[PDB]
């Protein structure tokens, strides 16, 4: 329905699928990266019924479906379910067809190469896209925030990346890829809500908990003080209404979950927290770099939207950092969806139109070509 | 008795049609009620929490 | 006809009773409901009105 061959831009993560066209300032539509399948035997005849449901269809009919996410902490493994997600994203939402548009997809700098190769292969072989470009999420995160220099803190559902970039250059030895993410927070919250007498173990229950987290959770600037009062009084409790009419009242779990970002040991992770990884990624850089990176810690992705998160990390980084120098976190409202915006910025740059893999070079070389053409 | 019946059936069916409409009014009313409660709850709570977290300005 | 009338009259009464029972529970619903309806939005509305001003600092 577009009147120009604008690139399509999409962030296909372990959580949400964000999509729109290059040149806009927001995805046109956002939905979960879900393909659902019936877990029951049908008994009525002439009921239609799909073998599998996609995106909002998967959630709408979820009462009898098991729901799977094709992307595992940033990498695509179930490419067949992702073909369905892309087809839905492009044709039933954006009303575009990749065949008529070049397409940009994105991944973290230390994401296994298999992800970039499979995304390239499917868009060229099943969607016949005229061109492809796998972008770096860190590049897109700083484009959207307006920086050439800073730390990308992309703390979303899949993985936290923690990468320093200076004057548009990577400083890769200082990347602290961390297995701590929004996805772990959903499962951790299911376990601490079990402690309160409300057990959650199934897909429907997981989707309920993801909704509780997204609507009730925060981290707070001072954890121990927030904990002491939440654990002592109903004044810091907040209720949540479940799809079936049940009501759950949540106290310190409201922040104890999110606090795992600063205390990863809560989920058994060997980590000092996201503020230390930010700190060390800067400390491993030269001193004429550090002055600019400490003043530009930049948030992207989910969990960055929690109350107290920018202040919590800035406080800890500042405490670890030397004096005189200023430490600051950049945390714009275009949060959680800013990498998509960065994709639009990259896709539309005049300096980027020579970076595309065309569907000529692709067939001559095969999908491994992405490893040499994109970055 | 037939006329009384037709009248009694008219009343029973009138009332059944009317009660159906009233039952619908209740279903709608309760959905409206829930909207009032849910919006109220959401507003009162989004403010208690917005003000409890947004205290530093 | 007598039995149908008794059943229809009984049903005329039960259906009309259900009608006046629901008209009443509906009124008693709606009336108490409008109270919520008129105060939940007015409280939240005046809270939001006040917020525009509460935030004028």
């Amino acid at each position: 329905d577009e009147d120009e061959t604008t690139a399509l831009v999409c962030d296909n993560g372990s959580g949400l699928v964000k999509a729109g066209f290059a040149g806009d300032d927001a995805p046109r539509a956002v939905f979960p990266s879900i393909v659902g399948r019936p877990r029951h035997q049908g008994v009525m005849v002439g009921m239609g019924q799909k073998d599998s449901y996609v995106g909002d269809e998967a959630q709408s009919k979820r009462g009898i479906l098991t729901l799977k996410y094709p992307i595992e902490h940033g990498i695509i493994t179930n490419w067949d379910d992702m073909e369905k997600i892309w087809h839905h994203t492009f044709y039933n939402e954006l009303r575009v067809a990749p065949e008529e548009h070049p397409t940009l997809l994105t991944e973290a700098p230390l994401n296994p190469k298999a992800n970039r190769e499979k995304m390239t292969q499917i868009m060229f072989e099943t969607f016949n896209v005229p061109a492809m470009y796998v972008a770096i999420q860190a590049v897109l995160s700083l484009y959207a925030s307006g920086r050439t220099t800073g730390i990308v803190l992309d703390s979303g559902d899949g993985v936290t990346h923690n990468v320093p970039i200076y004057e548009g250059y990577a400083l890769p030895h200082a990347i602290m890829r961390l297995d701590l993410a929004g996805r772990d927070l959903t499962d951790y919250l299911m376990k601490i809500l079990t402690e309160r007498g409300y057990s959650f173990v199934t897909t429907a229950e997981r989707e309920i908990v993801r909704d509780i987290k997204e609507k009730l959770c925060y981290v707070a600037l001072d954890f121990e003080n927030e904990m002491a009062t939440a654990a002592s009084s109903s004044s810091l409790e907040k209720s949540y209404e479940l799809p079936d009419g049940q009501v759950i009242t949540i106290g310190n779990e409201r922040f104890r979950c999110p606090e795992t970002l600063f205390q990863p040991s809560f989920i058994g992770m060997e980590s000092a927290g996201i503020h230390e990884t930010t700190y060390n990624s800067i400390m491993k850089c030269d001193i004429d770099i550090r002055k600019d990176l400490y003043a530009n810690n930049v948030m992207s992705g989910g969990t960055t939207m929690y109350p107290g998160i920018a202040d919590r990390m800035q406080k800890e980084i500042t405490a670890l950092a030397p004096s005189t120098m200023k430490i600051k976190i950049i945390a714009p409202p275009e949060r959680k969806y800013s990498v998509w915006i960065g994709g639009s910025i990259l896709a539309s740059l005049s300096t980027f139109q020579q970076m595309w893999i065309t569907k000529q070079e692709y067939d001559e070389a095969g999908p491994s070509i992405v490893h040499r053409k994109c970055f | 008795l037939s006329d009384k019946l037709k009248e009694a059936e008219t009343r029973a069916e009138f009332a059944e049609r009317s009660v159906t409409k009233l039952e619908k009014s209740i279903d709608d009313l309760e959905d409206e009620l829930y909207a009032q409660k849910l919006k109220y709850k959401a507003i009162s709570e989004e403010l208690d929490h917005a003000l409890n977290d947004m205290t530093s300005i | 006809l007598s039995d149908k009338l008794k059943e229809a009259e009984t049903r005329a009464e039960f259906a009309e009773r259900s009608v006046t029972k629901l008209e009443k529970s509906i009124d008693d619903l709606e009336d108490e409901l409008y109270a919520q309806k008129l105060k939940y939005k007015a409280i939240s509305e005046e809270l939001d009105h006040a917020l525009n001003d509460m935030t004028s600092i």
Binding site: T324, K326, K328 | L47, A50, L51, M54, S56, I57 | L51, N52, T55, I57
Partner: peptide, 29 residues
């Protein structure tokens, strides 16, 4: 409090920047 969410960001950023300037203005010696 949408008014606050943004005014909060504005004032925290503006005071932090003004304070950073106050501190540097003296600290530079």
């Amino acid at each position: 409090m949408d008014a606050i969410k943004k005014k909060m960001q504005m004032l925290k950023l503006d005071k932090e920047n003004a304070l950073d300037r106050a501190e540097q203005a003296e600290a530079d010696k």
